Design an enzyme around this catalytic site. Sequence first.
Site, mmCIF file in Angstrom:
data_model
loop_
_atom_site.group_PDB
_atom_site.id
_atom_site.type_symbol
_atom_site.label_atom_id
_atom_site.label_comp_id
_atom_site.label_asym_id
_atom_site.label_seq_id
_atom_site.Cartn_x
_atom_site.Cartn_y
_atom_site.Cartn_z
ATOM 1 N N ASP A 89 34.228 80.247 -7.994
ATOM 2 C CA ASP A 89 33.234 79.220 -7.802
ATOM 3 C C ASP A 89 31.780 79.671 -7.898
ATOM 4 O OD1 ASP A 89 32.404 76.986 -5.101
ATOM 5 O OD2 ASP A 89 32.104 76.843 -7.281
ATOM 6 N N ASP A 101 28.192 74.872 -12.430
ATOM 7 C CA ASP A 101 29.134 74.975 -11.359
ATOM 8 C C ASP A 101 30.587 74.971 -11.799
ATOM 9 O OD1 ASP A 101 30.771 74.660 -9.120
ATOM 10 O OD2 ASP A 101 29.964 72.681 -8.610
HETATM 11 C C1 LIG Z 1 35.000 69.804 -6.302
HETATM 12 C C2 LIG Z 1 34.330 70.727 -5.328
HETATM 13 O O1 LIG Z 1 33.991 70.311 -4.222
HETATM 14 N N1 LIG Z 1 34.115 71.989 -5.750
HETATM 15 C C3 LIG Z 1 33.530 73.057 -4.940
HETATM 16 C C4 LIG Z 1 34.542 74.210 -4.920
HETATM 17 C C5 LIG Z 1 35.902 73.606 -4.588
HETATM 18 C C6 LIG Z 1 36.905 73.538 -5.558
HETATM 19 C C7 LIG Z 1 38.135 72.959 -5.238
HETATM 20 F F1 LIG Z 1 39.104 72.890 -6.143
HETATM 21 C C8 LIG Z 1 38.396 72.425 -3.981
HETATM 22 C C9 LIG Z 1 37.399 72.493 -3.041
HETATM 23 F F2 LIG Z 1 37.663 71.985 -1.869
HETATM 24 C C10 LIG Z 1 36.161 73.066 -3.316
HETATM 25 C C11 LIG Z 1 32.106 73.440 -5.395
HETATM 26 O O2 LIG Z 1 31.552 74.520 -4.634
HETATM 27 C C12 LIG Z 1 31.141 72.273 -5.249
HETATM 28 N N2 LIG Z 1 29.760 72.612 -5.621
HETATM 29 C C13 LIG Z 1 28.617 71.737 -5.227
HETATM 30 C C14 LIG Z 1 28.692 71.689 -3.693
HETATM 31 C C15 LIG Z 1 29.167 70.568 -2.997
HETATM 32 C C16 LIG Z 1 29.292 70.641 -1.600
HETATM 33 C C17 LIG Z 1 28.956 71.800 -0.884
HETATM 34 C C18 LIG Z 1 28.481 72.938 -1.531
HETATM 35 N N3 LIG Z 1 28.198 74.077 -0.910
HETATM 36 C C19 LIG Z 1 29.093 74.699 -0.139
HETATM 37 C C20 LIG Z 1 28.459 75.869 0.229
HETATM 38 C C21 LIG Z 1 27.200 75.911 -0.360
HETATM 39 N N4 LIG Z 1 27.024 74.799 -1.106
HETATM 40 C C22 LIG Z 1 28.394 72.847 -2.935
HETATM 41 C C23 LIG Z 1 27.322 72.401 -5.645
HETATM 42 C C24 LIG Z 1 26.134 71.499 -5.366
HETATM 43 C C25 LIG Z 1 26.273 70.217 -6.178
HETATM 44 C C26 LIG Z 1 27.528 69.480 -5.796
HETATM 45 C C27 LIG Z 1 28.742 70.375 -5.954
#
Ligand SMILES: CC(=O)N[C@@H](Cc1cc(F)cc(F)c1)[C@H](O)CNC1(c2cccc(-n3cccn3)c2)CCCCC1
Length: 375
Positions: free
Chosen positions: A35, A219
């Site tokens: 990620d 991302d």
């Molecule tokens: C689908 C999903 O949500 N993917 C996870 C990865 C992922 C993949 C998957 F398959 C299942 C999941 F639960 C999570 C990924 O980071 C999301 N990345 C963002 C995000 C969204 C919410 C929180 C955070 N964040 C967290 C820590 C710091 N920033 C990051 C980055 C900012 C813009 C929106 C998407």
Amino acid sequence: SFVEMVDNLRGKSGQGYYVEMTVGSPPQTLNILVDTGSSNFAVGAAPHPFLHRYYQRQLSSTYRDLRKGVYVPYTQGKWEGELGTDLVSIPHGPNVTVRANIAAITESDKFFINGSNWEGILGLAYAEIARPDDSLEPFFDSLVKQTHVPNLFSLQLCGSVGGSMIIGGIDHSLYTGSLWYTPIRREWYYEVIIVRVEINGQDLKMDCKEYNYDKSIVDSGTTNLRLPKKVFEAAVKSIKAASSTEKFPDGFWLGEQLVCWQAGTTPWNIFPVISLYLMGEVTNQSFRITILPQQYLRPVEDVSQDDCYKFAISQSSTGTVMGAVIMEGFYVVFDRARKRIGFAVSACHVHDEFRTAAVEGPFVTLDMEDCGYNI
Ligand SMILES: CC(=O)N[C@@H](Cc1cc(F)cc(F)c1)[C@H](O)CNC1(c2cccc(-n3cccn3)c2)CCCCC1
């Protein structure tokens, strides 16, 4: 010796990409999801009905406890657990062993996926967004600190999917044409600036602020291309009209209903290419990456004799997210060392008979930092 790292990634469609890792002494083998959209290294440390195996701190001679809980929410799923350190390795990656922070996941909600095959997550973004605070050095920073591995990585993600994560270099055997770089606007998320958008060579003619409101990031953790409300709406309008000859449900344009045609009769030509122009390395200079319909229409397996697809551009309201769907066309260099992301045409590009996804430059574009959003 980057060849040992080619094809070190797998995944199911829509469930993200993973690399094999070890933790502890003796080594414990997990699949870790890769990620660029977060900064935390977490692994499941307790039973779960979707977990096929997990991490048992007790059996690691080199576990060390930090006695701190942690919590991380994602776009939908979330998890909480306990922070320790331990030794970590990537069998199909550089030949080193590092002591890195690990969140041991104790409970979790809508995180692990059924028949997921992955057991943890590897947040490759920057400390600034680490949980609980930014003093929790993300995995990759540790690696750079403790070794000679250059502060650089690249991801080639391909269309039962696979790809490669080249740690610490670029592998020329994995792209064609020229690498084009766009500056990382700020080291938190992999943040970038989109300066112009064209659908079928027509500019959406919005104030370029709307492209990066509130941010634009690269991302791997997100599947879709995700666009701010206003940009999403204009895009849809323009794609509805380039393909109005055919007709669909509305769940479809919202990524709910699938749509179907008989095998091989999939009418590609009626879907427009999208060009996203990124800020360049040179003053007034930009470049473009052009997306094929083959990317923004993910396949789904039926359920039977028809090829069926989900629309993989969805709404956002935390800015533009160049998800896997955008990244699949391209070899993507994360030049941490030089605060830039490079894009080239992937070796595993997917080939329409008549049109082709491109990294193309250079373009001229004025007042480009009028394009970045400020709170
Ligand atoms: C689908 C999903 O949500 N993917 C996870 C990865 C992922 C993949 C998957 F398959 C299942 C999941 F639960 C999570 C990924 O980071 C999301 N990345 C963002 C995000 C969204 C919410 C929180 C955070 N964040 C967290 C820590 C710091 N920033 C990051 C980055 C900012 C813009 C929106 C998407």
